[PDB]
C-alpha cells in the first residue's frame, strides 16, 4: 500500500503549475490523481509550489491540529492553492469540481523521518 507520505504527494501537491489554469482543473485533476475512483472525494487540495517548499512548512510554525493534535505546522508565507469541491448534481461515474484558486498558507500535519507532510488539514 501507499505510504502516507507518497499519498500526501499524489493528493496535495501539483507543482507544475503556479495556480488553477481554467475552471475545469478539478476536474481534469481529481482524475489524474486517482481520487475519482470508487466515489468522488468531496474536497481536495493542491498546493502550487514546490515539493521541497511544502516539506519545509513541518520545520515552521508548530500549531494544534483541527483534530486537537499536534504535529500541524503552518506555512510562514501564503502559496498558491487550488481547492476542489465536488458540486451538488454531481454523481458518478462523473464527478463534477468547483475550482477556486487563492494563496494562502496551508497547514500540514508531519511525520516519519524524514519527518514529512502526511496530512493537509487546512488553509489560511
Do not use: W
Not at 458518478?92 to 524524514?114: D, F, L, R, S
Amino acid at each position: 500500500k501507499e505510504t502516507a507520505a507518497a499519498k500526501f504527494e499524489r493528493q496535495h501537491m501539483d507543482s507544475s503549475t503556479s495556480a488553477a489554469s481554467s475552471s475545469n482543473y478539478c476536474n481534469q485533476m481529481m482524475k489524474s490523481r486517482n481520487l475519482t475512483k470508487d466515489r468522488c472525494k468531496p474536497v481536495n487540495t493542491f498546493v502550487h509550489e514546490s515539493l521541497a517548499d511544502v516539506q519545509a512548512v513541518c520545520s515552521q510554525k508548530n500549531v494544534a491540529c483541527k483534530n486537537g493534535q499536534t504535529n500541524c505546522y503552518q506555512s510562514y508565507s501564503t502559496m498558491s492553492i487550488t481547492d476542489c469541491r465536488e458540486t451538488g448534481s454531481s454523481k458518478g461515474p462523473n464527478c463534477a469540481y468547483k475550482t477556486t484558486q487563492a494563496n494562502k498558507h496551508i497547514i500540514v500535519a508531519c511525520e516519519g523521518n524524514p519527518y514529512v507532510p502526511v496530512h493537509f488539514d487546512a488553509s489560511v
